[PDB]
Design a protein around this nucleic acid. Sequence first.
RNA 1: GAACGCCCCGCCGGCGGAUGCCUCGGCCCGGGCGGCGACGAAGAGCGCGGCGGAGCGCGAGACGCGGUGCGGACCCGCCCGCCCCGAGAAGCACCGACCCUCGAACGCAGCGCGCCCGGCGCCGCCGCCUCGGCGCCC
Length: 154
Amino acid sequence: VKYAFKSDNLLVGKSRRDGVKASFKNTYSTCRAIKGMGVKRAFAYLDNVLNHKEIVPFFKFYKGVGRHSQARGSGTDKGRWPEKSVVVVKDILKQAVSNAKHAHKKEEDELYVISYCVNRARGRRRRTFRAHGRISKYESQPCHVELIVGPKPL
RNA sequence: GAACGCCCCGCCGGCGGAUGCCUCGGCCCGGGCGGCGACGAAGAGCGCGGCGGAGCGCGAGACGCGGUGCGGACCCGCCCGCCCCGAGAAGCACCGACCCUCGAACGCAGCGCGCCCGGCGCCGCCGCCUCGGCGCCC
Ligand SMILES: [Mg+2]
Ligand SMILES: [Mg+2]
Ligand SMILES: [Mg+2]
Ligand SMILES: [Mg+2]
């Protein structure tokens, strides 16, 4: 699809992935948790989620997400450690930093995460069997993911 | 407080397939025509292309063969082939043939078997061959 970020007087690095086989709600929260970070920080932070040293806070899709001790100062008490969404976002981040560090020779020490947009895509459609002869749906909820890197926001 | 939610002050993305325009199709009326079959029909099965599934077509001569006319440069891919005052690609019309199994379906059965060395089903009409009767007579 097309890009949702339209700025025209910044030097940016961009990458996207269309139709990602990962939960939409999990992946939205992972991208919103790294917004505004410098790209050194977000790369460490994402490796810590993999190792259960930090959490992803959940501000939008949280009914049934458990409260945990690792989320004390964030604004909420709820979070999780989505391992498959962190695998996707890390690889999309590296393309955008490569795209920027190669089009204009800017270091990772002045790059920041300044935009994101997650959108709902069209899923795989299977079926499950219910009692008394009935059939029901069993679908996936995939996503489109985009991520922009550039200079410190102000 | 922030956030969630809600409204839109506006700028962009998704999901979905409405609206508009388009149409080798339907529907209605009128005119023709009225042309199947034991010389094996209608229908069914199986098989047939250099690379070939479906549908059209064809029948072991199988994605076609011949004859008379016409036509005159191509043959959707990859190849082949044709090319010329006739040498002949596409296309068209009539005519002659080929025409596996089942089916009115015809040696019996439906996939297996015979009688006889041509062959070998039922009904009816007309003839003919060979015959029966303590029918009527001689
Ligand atoms: Mg069940
Ligand atoms: Mg049942
Ligand atoms: Mg075929
Ligand atoms: Mg027969």
